Structures are given as structure tokens and as C-alpha cells.
Design a protein around this ligand. Structure first.
Ligand SMILES: *[C@@H]1O[C@H](CO)[C@@H](O[C@@H]2O[C@H](CO)[C@@H](O[C@@H]3O[C@H](CO[C@H]4O[C@H](CO)[C@@H](O)[C@H](O)[C@@H]4O[C@H]4O[C@H](CO)[C@@H](O)[C@H](O)[C@@H]4O)[C@@H](O)[C@H](O[C@H]4O[C@H](CO)[C@@H](O)[C@H](O)[C@@H]4O)[C@@H]3O)[C@H](O)[C@H]2NC(C)=O)[C@H](O)[C@H]1NC(C)=O
Ligand code: TB
Lengths: 138, 300
């Protein structure tokens, strides 16, 4: 149902961009979410829905005040393409008929904390789509 | 409390150290007459009864206290000191490796995502050392991690003095190799040198301490020119299946310039030359952790 090879290509680009940018209530790919190899065989919809939930989560943060305002991101910063690739991959995971979409200046620390958490998330997502494209594909 | 039980009959006394510090008042208990009390191996008797009160101000007040009844030992009480100066606990037993960051006393490493890892630490002390290691994932609701015994693993000579290396192996009880970690693993090491008690902690995610084993079965196959087909395989200790836990590689042609090639395949074609070697190392493809050690084979 999902374009596995397209998702593999986009998720691989996400890992590259996530590390080019940065060389509690957060969604995580937990153990019971079925993103392991055996879980993807039984049913991949559970994992792919969790991945989609994390993608829209990080997409909102990258477009929020945390990253839009100052200190202004360098004109050639990888965050711009990173936000676009997050939206590009989450769009590929939304099937028809389903609607899954649902103070101090020292907050540069939060920027690096979000991107560090993002690097871990897209790493697991990239492994899921690379494994699915290699096994769950015609 | 300022005095607490570390092990059976072993107690740590938290000492705020400064000139003329009052120390702590410690009350003992013997597990009814003739109940004399000694310190270490001196017959000088310091109290009678089941309870004994002493003021611990320095290391001379620490040691093994023993309640004695009629020339017969009944119980023991070892007092160790955890020294605190200006707010910081002493860190004299372990050497600061100072990398990747300052105040790094424990360094840990994993070869895969199985939840098993090894931690190392160094010291200039050669005798009278006792180490105890405990670990858990999370601090609020700790998840089980099982660690083995700390043993002496290496001994190097750095400068005039000698460095002593200790290691320990730990394994997460219920590991999930493919999941995205949200709670870090905590490693706690108790260190005792004679009567001095200290402890050290390290916090990390398994993904951040990954260092794969070198590529295995590195071989060369010349063609007919200077071209050569390089081939290798994933290491045996790496996480499976490889279609999920993928590795990326760096192929290097070096003679004692540097020609480096980055590839995701387990093979490559390079140009050999006189007295040069072909080296390959591995890294997690999707998360930039440590590179493996070089696997090398000489040309021709
Ligand atoms: C590394 O070295 C550290 C420095 O020595 C060491 O810290 C000390 O650990 C001991 C052992 O845990 C502490 O003594 C114990 O204190 C307990 C009460 O304190 C905590 O529990 C209460 C609820 O039960 C809370 O209300 C308190 O706020 C407190 O929580 C604190 O936790 C940490 C310290 O652990 C602190 O940093 C936080 O800010 C919190 O304030 C007692 O219950 C213990 O008594 C036990 O035994 C008695 C006698 O049998 C029984 O009556 C009790 O029921 C209980 O069984 C014990 O006294 C000591 O306070 C710590 N010192 C400091 C300065 O915090 C640390 O543990 C070492 N690390 C490792 C891994 O060993
Ligand atoms: Tb006190």
C-alpha cells in the first residue's frame, strides 16, 4: 500500500539532512509499536501510523517559533529542506479515506535537543522503510 | 541520611570536610556484659553496651569497629568516609579521561543494539581497591539491567607511573534492539580505596555508544590493470537482520596520500600501488555513531 522505495529514498535523505543540521511529551518508536522486522511482517500499518505521527510532530516544531525566529538560521541551513522532507514523507504515508493528521533567548538549546531527538527518530524510520523495500516489496 | 548502609556491616559516613569541621555523630549497634569496643586491631577499649556513639571527623575515626564479649567477637561495623569539600564529592580513585567531555570517569561501548555493553575505567592505584557496578534504564521507574563483576582488564605504563584498567559487562534485561530509545541507560560504580568511598555515574543511549566490529573477511581480487575488486562482510557481532540494521563503509587506499571512498555495498573497486594497503571500516548507516576499527590487507 505505501511506496516503499519512495519512502526509503525520502527517509534516507531525512537522516542526511538531520545530521547536516546538527553535526517527555515527544512521540517515540516504542517497542510495542511493531516497527521491528517481525512486527512489520505481521502488520506494518501500526508502525507506519506511528512514524507518520512522529513526522507531523517534528514538522510542526521545525516550522514553529523555536526555529523561525532569532537567532536567524544561516541562509544555507539544512533545516529548510529538513522541514520540506518531513512533509514530503508524511504525505506519502497518508492513504486515501484515512485522516491521520491530528521565554529566554537561550532556547537554542531546545533547537539542538529537538534535532538530536529527530536524528534518533528518522534513523529508526529509515531502517523500517529500507527493510520493507527489501522484503515487503514486489 | 548522612550515614547509610552500603553493604552488610559496611556504612558510608558523608563527611563535609573543612578546617575544624565537627564531622558526624555515628551510633553503632551490636548484633550483655563485657561488650567492649575496638578499632581495627587495637585492644584499646572505647565503650560498653549494645550501642556505641563516636564522632567521626577524619579517616582516623573510620575503620572496622568490633563489639567484643568475653574475648569472643560478636559483630563488626566498617565505616567508610565519603568526603565532600565545598559541595563536590572527591573523585581521587578514578582517573578523568576527559573525553568526549570533561569529568568523564566511565566510558562505555556497544558492538550492536542487543542491549549488551561494556564499560571501562582507569586508576593509578594498584591495591586495596573494591569496585561494584549497577545499572538500569530510567531513573524514576528503573528497568532491569544486569551487570557482571568488575575485573582488571589491562595495565599500561603512562609516564613513570602505571595505569590500571578495569572493565565490566552489562546487559539490559528486556532489550528492544529496534526501538527508539527515550530513557537513557544509567551506569553506577561504587569505588572503595581503603577507607575512602566514592561513586561515579554515566548516562547514555545505546545508539550513542555504538562501535561496530571491523569488517570481516577483507579480500582483494586483481583484474586485467591496477584495478582490484575489494570485498568484505558484515561483522558477526552486528545486529541482525542486516536489511534492517544496515552499515555504511569507508574504503581507503593508503601507503606509508589518502584515497577514501564511501559506499553502502560490501564491495568496491580501487587502484592498488606499491607498498600500499586497502583498509575498510564500518559505521551505522542511519545514525552517526563511532566508526569501527580499520580492517586492512596489503596490496599484491
Ligand atoms: C553515591 O554517593 C552519594 C553520596 O554519598 C549517595 O547519596 C546518598 O545515598 C544514600 C542511600 O540512598 C542516602 O541515604 C538514604 O536516604 C533515604 C532517604 O532519602 C531519600 O528518600 C526519602 C523518601 O524515602 C525522600 O523523601 C528524600 O528526599 C530522599 O530522596 C533523596 O534522594 C537522593 C539521595 O538518595 C537525593 O539526592 C534527592 O535530592 C532526594 O532528596 C533513607 O530512606 C535511607 O535510609 C534507609 O535506611 C534507614 C535505616 O535502616 C531506614 O530507616 C530507611 O527506611 C531506609 O531504608 C538512607 O538514609 C543519602 O541521603 C544520599 N546522600 C545525599 C547527600 O543525597 C548515592 O546514593 C550514591 N550512589 C549510589 C548509586 O550508591
Ligand atoms: Tb551533618
Amino acid at each position: 500500500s505505501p511506496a516503499w522505495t519512495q519512502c526509503q529514498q525520502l527517509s534516507q535523505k531525512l537522516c542526511t539532512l538531520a545530521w547536516s543540521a546538527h553535526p517527555n511529551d515527544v512521540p517515540h518508536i516504542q517497542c510495542g509499536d511493531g516497527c521491528d522486522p517481525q512486527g512489520l511482517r505481521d502488520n506494518s500499518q501500526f508502525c507506519l501510523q506511528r512514524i507518520h505521527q512522529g513526522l507531523i510532530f517534528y514538522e510542526k516544531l521545525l516550522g514553529s517559533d523555536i526555529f523561525t525566529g532569532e537567532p536567524s538560521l544561516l541562509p544555507d541551513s539544512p533545516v529548510g529542506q529538513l522541514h520540506a522532507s518531513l512533509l514530503g514523507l508524511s504525505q506519502l504515508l497518508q492513504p486515501e479515506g484515512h485522516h491521520w493528521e491530528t521565554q529566554p533567548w537561550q532556547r537554542l538549546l531546545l533547537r539542538f535537543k529537538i534535532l538530536r531527538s529527530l536524528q534518533a527518530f528518522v534513523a529508526v524510520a529509515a531502517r523500517v522503510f529500507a527493510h520493507g523495500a527489501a522484503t515487503l516489496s514486489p | 541520611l548522612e550515614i547509610w548502609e552500603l553493604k552488610k556491616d559496611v556504612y558510608v559516613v558523608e563527611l563535609d570536610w573543612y578546617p575544624d569541621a565537627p564531622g558526624e555523630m555515628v551510633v553503632l549497634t551490636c548484633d550483655e556484659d563485657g561488650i567492649t569496643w575496638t578499632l581495627d586491631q587495637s585492644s584499646e577499649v572505647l565503650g560498653s553496651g549494645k550501642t556505641l556513639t563516636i564522632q567521626v571527623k577524619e579517616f582516623g575515626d573510620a575503620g572496622q569497629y568490633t563489639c567484643h564479649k568475653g574475648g569472643e567477637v560478636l559483630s563488626h561495623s566498617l565505616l567508610l568516609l565519603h568526603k565532600k569539600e565545598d559541595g563536590i564529592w572527591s573523585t581521587d580513585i578514578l582517573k578523568d579521561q576527559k573525553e568526549p567531555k570533561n569529568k568523564t570517569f566511565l566510558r562505555c561501548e556497544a558492538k550492536n543494539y542487543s542491549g549488551r555493553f561494556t564499560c571501562w575505567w582507569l586508576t593509578t592505584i594498584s591495591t586495596d581497591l573494591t569496585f561494584s557496578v549497577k545499572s538500569s534504564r530510567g531513573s524514576s521507574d528503573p528497568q532491569g539491567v544486569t551487570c557482571g563483576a568488575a575485573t582488571l582488564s589491562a595495565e599500561r605504563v603512562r609516564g613513570d607511573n602505571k595505569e590500571y584498567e578495569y572493565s565490566v559487562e552489562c546487559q539490559e534485561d528486556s532489550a528492544c534492539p529496534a526501538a527508539e530509545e527515550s530513557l537513557p541507560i544509567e551506569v553506577m560504580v561504587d569505588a572503595v580505596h581503603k577507607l575512602k568511598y566514592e561513586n561515579y555515574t554515566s548516562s547514555f543511549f545505546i545508539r550513542d555508544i555504538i562501535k561496530p566490529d571491523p569488517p570481516k573477511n577483507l579480500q582483494l581480487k586483481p583484474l586485467k590493470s591496477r584495478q582490484v575488486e575489494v570485498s568484505w562482510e558484515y561483522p558477526d557481532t552486528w545486529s541482525t537482520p542486516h536489511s534492517y540494521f544496515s552499515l555504511t563503509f569507508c574504503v581507503q587506499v593508503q601507503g606509508k596520500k589518502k584515497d577514501r571512498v564511501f559506499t553502502d555495498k560490501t564491495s568496491a573497486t580501487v587502484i592498488c600501488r606499491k607498498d600500499a594497503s586497502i583498509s575498510v571500516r564500518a559505521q551505522d548507516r542511519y545514525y552517526s555513531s563511532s566508526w569501527s576499527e580499520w580492517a586492512s590487507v596489503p596490496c599484491s
